[PDB]
DNA sequence: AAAAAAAAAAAAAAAAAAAAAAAAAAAAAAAAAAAAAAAAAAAAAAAAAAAAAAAAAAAAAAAAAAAAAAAAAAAAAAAAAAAAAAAAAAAAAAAAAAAAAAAAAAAAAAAAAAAAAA
């Protein structure tokens, strides 16, 4: 479950992940987040 | 686009380490008595020096313990086999100076934003 928020006054979005898969850890969900950023893997990533 | 290797799921096998608390011993590093050793003073037994002397090597010569010869017999030591102790030769090594790659601070300047003036 991932939708796209929007804010009302700036035009910024966030990306809210309310569930994850079955069998997966948050934390390495969130330390390969942290990589991809890292490495320049994914483009776009603001905070987390 | 093919090959290869990591990692993660869950039942199995098998291990490792840090501290507290008291009382005794064992290493290991220091002050501090205590005695060799060394520098620099005065001080005092020994060599010198000389005259004077008498005790032991020479010399005669007998004789009595001796060192070579003979014999028998016992068996220490030497050289050849093995089997251990203990030391130079040579090579290796762990920290350790040198080099190279990544994290944090820096401001110049502008995009976007927030806020307010007339």
Redesign the pocket.
């Known amino acids: 479950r991932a939708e796209v928020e929007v804010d009302a ?4 979005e966030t990306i809210i992940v309310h569930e994850i898969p079955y ?1 997966v ?1 948050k934390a ?1 969900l969130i330390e390969k987040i942290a990589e991809l950023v ?1 490495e320049k893997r994914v483009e776009g990533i603001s905070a987390l």
């Open positions: 006054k700036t035009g910024r069998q850890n390495r890292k």
